[PDB]
Design a protein around this ligand. Structure first.
Ligand SMILES: *[C@@H]1O[C@H](CO[C@H]2O[C@@H](C)[C@@H](O)[C@@H](O)[C@@H]2O)[C@@H](O[C@@H]2O[C@H](CO)[C@@H](O[C@@H]3O[C@H](CO[C@H]4O[C@H](CO)[C@@H](O)[C@H](O)[C@@H]4O[C@@H]4O[C@H](CO)[C@@H](O)[C@H](O)[C@H]4NC(C)=O)[C@@H](O)[C@H](O[C@H]4O[C@H](CO)[C@@H](O)[C@H](O)[C@@H]4O[C@@H]4O[C@H](CO)[C@@H](O)[C@H](O)[C@H]4NC(C)=O)[C@@H]3O)[C@H](O)[C@H]2NC(C)=O)[C@H](O)[C@H]1NC(C)=O
Ligand SMILES: *[C@@H]1O[C@H](CO[C@H]2O[C@@H](C)[C@@H](O)[C@@H](O)[C@@H]2O)[C@@H](O[C@@H]2O[C@H](CO)[C@@H](O[C@@H]3O[C@H](CO[C@H]4O[C@H](CO)[C@@H](O)[C@H](O)[C@@H]4O[C@@H]4O[C@H](CO)[C@@H](O)[C@H](O)[C@H]4NC(C)=O)[C@@H](O)[C@H](O[C@H]4O[C@H](CO)[C@@H](O)[C@H](O)[C@@H]4O[C@@H]4O[C@H](CO)[C@@H](O)[C@H](O)[C@H]4NC(C)=O)[C@@H]3O)[C@H](O)[C@H]2NC(C)=O)[C@H](O)[C@H]1NC(C)=O
Lengths: 205, 205
C-alpha cells in the first residue's frame, strides 16, 4: 500500500520551509525492503527526491518515506505530482498521484479570546484563538508575542462543523505574569481563502 | 480479519447505558458464516456475551458483531478483555485483546467562554468550552441549555499538549438572540479523573 501526501500550507505559502510532496510505503515484506521511488511532475521524471531508509513497525512490517522537494508555483498552478514505486518483490509497480485540490475555498474568521476569568486563579493561563468557517481544511496557525513566534501553543486538528466548513482552536500557554504584564499576543493564520492568504489578530491586557 | 473496540466513555463513566467491549469480524466466506466467539477477562472465559447474526456487505462478504457487556470497574482497573474467534472454516483461531489506554489519570479543568465581542456582529455566535489537562484521552463532552442537552455543538478531537496531557474545545453554535436572551448554557464533561467522574460549568450573557 502506497500513500501520497500534499505539501504543508505553511511551506507552500512561504510561511516556512521548502514544500514537499511525501510518498509513504507501508506493509513492506521484512524480506525484501529494497523499495525504489520514481517521481514525476506531469509524467516527466525528476531526481531531486530524497528517500529515507525503511523502519520497522510493531507488526514486523516495514515503512519507507520519500520526499519530493517542490516549487510553490508548480503546486499552486495545479501540476500533477506522481510517485511511482516498484517494490522489486512486488508483482507490479504501484503509483499514486496528487495535485492542488479543486473544491470551492472559504476563508475563515479569526477571533482571539482572553483567559477565562476563573483560570486567572492559576499560575498558568490560556490565550485562545478561534478559527472558523474555512475550507479546504489545509491551514496553518501560530502564535506570536511582541512580534516573536512562540513555542508553547498547540492547534487542534481542523474539525468538521454543522455547516460543512471546518473550525479549530489554537491555545497558547503562558504564565499568568506574562498575560498581566501586557505583552502583545498575535494569532497568525495562513489560508488560501484569506485576502493575501493570511490574517493576524492581536490582543493584550 | 477481526477488530476489537473499547467501551463508550459515556457508558463507562455512568453517563449512560451498559459499557461493552465490541468485537467485529469482517471478510467472512459467504460459504461458512458459522463464526463463534469466546470472551475472556484476563484469560478467564465468560458467557455473558451477546453475538449478532452475520450481515451481507457490498463485496458479497459477511460481517459479525459480538458485544461483551462489562462492569465499569473492570475497565477502569485495567483488566484485559480478550475475544477469541475461531471461524470454523479458518486455519486457526483469531484473537484480539484490549484494555484501558495507559497509565496514571489526571482530571481536566473546565472553562466556559462567551462569544468573542467581534462575533456579536454576526447572526450566529459561538459559546466555547475549554477542557484541558486530562489523561487518558478518553472523554465525553456535551452542551446543555436550561438543563436540556443540545444538538448544535461539536468537539475537537483530544489534542496532545506541550506538557503531555490532552486538551480540547467544544463549540456550541447558537443564534445571537439565544445568547442575549439569557438562557443558561452548561458545558458537561465526563472523565475518570474528575470527582464523581464529571463536572459541569455554566454561564450566560
Ligand atoms: C502495520 O503497521 C503500519 C504502521 O504501524 C503503525 O500504524 C499507525 C497507523 C498506528 O496504527 C500505529 O499504532 C502503528 O504502529 C501500518 O501502516 C499504516 O497503514 C494504514 C493503512 O490501514 C495507513 O492509513 C492511511 O492513513 C492515511 C492518512 O495518513 C496520515 O494520517 C495518519 C493518521 O494519523 C498518519 O499515521 C500518517 O502518518 C499520515 O500522516 C500525515 O503524513 C504526512 C507525510 O507522511 C504529513 O505531511 C502529514 O502532516 C501527516 N498528517 C498528520 C498531521 O497526521 C489515510 O488517508 C488513509 O485512508 C484513506 O485510504 C483508505 C484505504 O484503505 C480509505 O479507507 C480511507 O477512507 C482513506 O481514503 C481517502 O478518503 C478521503 C476522504 O475521507 C478521500 O478524499 C480520498 O480520496 C481517499 N483516498 C483513497 C482512494 O484511499 C489510510 O487510513 C497508515 O498511514 C499507515 N501508517 C503510516 C503512518 O505509515 C500498517 O497498516 C500495519 N499493517 C497491518 C499488519 O495491519
Ligand atoms: C468488504 O466490505 C466490508 C464492509 O463494507 C463496508 O466497509 C466500510 C469500511 C466502507 O468501505 C463501506 O463503503 C463498505 O461498504 C469491509 O469491512 C471493513 O474492513 C475494514 C478493514 O480494511 C475495517 O476497517 C477497520 O476499521 C477500524 C475502525 O472501525 C470503526 O471505524 C470504521 C470507520 O468509520 C467504521 O466503519 C467501523 O464500523 C468502526 O466504527 C466503530 O464501531 C464501533 C462498534 O462497531 C462503535 O462503538 C464506534 O462508535 C464506531 N466508531 C465510529 C463513531 O465510527 C480501524 O481501527 C481498523 O484500522 C486498524 O487496523 C488496520 C489493520 O489493517 C491498521 O492498518 C490501522 O492503522 C488500524 O490500526 C490501529 O491503529 C491505531 C492507531 O492508528 C492503533 O492504536 C491500534 O493499535 C491499531 N490496531 C491494529 C493492531 O490494527 C480498520 O481500518 C472496517 O471496520 C470494516 N467495516 C466494518 C464497519 O465492519 C471489508 O474490508 C471489505 N472487504 C474487501 C473485499 O475489501
Amino acid at each position: 500500500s502506497v500513500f501520497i501526501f500534499p505539501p504543508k500550507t505553511k511551506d507552500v505559502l512561504g510561511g516556512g520551509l521548502t514544500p514537499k510532496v511525501t510518498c509513504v510505503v507501508v506493509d513492506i515484506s521484512q524480506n525484501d525492503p529494497e523499495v525504489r521511488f520514481s517521481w514525476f511532475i506531469d509524467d516527466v521524471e525528476v531526481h531531486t527526491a530524497q528517500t529515507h531508509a525503511p523502519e520497522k513497525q510493531s507488526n514486523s512490517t516495514l515503512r519507507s518515506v520519500s520526499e519530493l522537494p517542490i516549487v510553490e508555483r508548480d503546486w499552486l498552478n495545479g501540476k500533477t505530482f506522481k510517485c511511482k514505486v516498484n517494490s522489486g518483490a512486488f508483482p507490479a509497480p504501484i503509483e499514486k498521484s496528487i495535485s492542488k485540490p479543486e473544491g470551492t475555498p472559504r476563508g475563515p474568521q479569526v477571533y482571539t479570546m482572553a483567559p477565562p476569568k476563573e483560570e486567572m486563579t492559576q499560575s498558568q493561563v490560556s490565550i485562545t484563538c478561534m478559527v472558523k468557517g474555512f475550507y479546504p481544511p489545509d491551514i496553518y496557525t501560530e502564535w506570536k508575542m511582541n512580534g516573536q513566534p512562540q513555542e508553547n501553543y498547540k492547534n487542534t486538528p481542523p474539525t468538521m462543523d454543522t455547516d460543512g466548513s471546518y473550525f479549530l482552536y489554537s491555545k497558547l500557554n503562558v504564565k499568568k505574569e506574562t498575560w498581566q504584564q501586557g505583552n502583545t499576543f498575535t494569532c497568525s493564520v495562513l489560508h488560501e481563502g484569506l485576502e493575501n492568504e493570511h490574517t493576524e489578530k492581536s490582543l493584550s491586557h
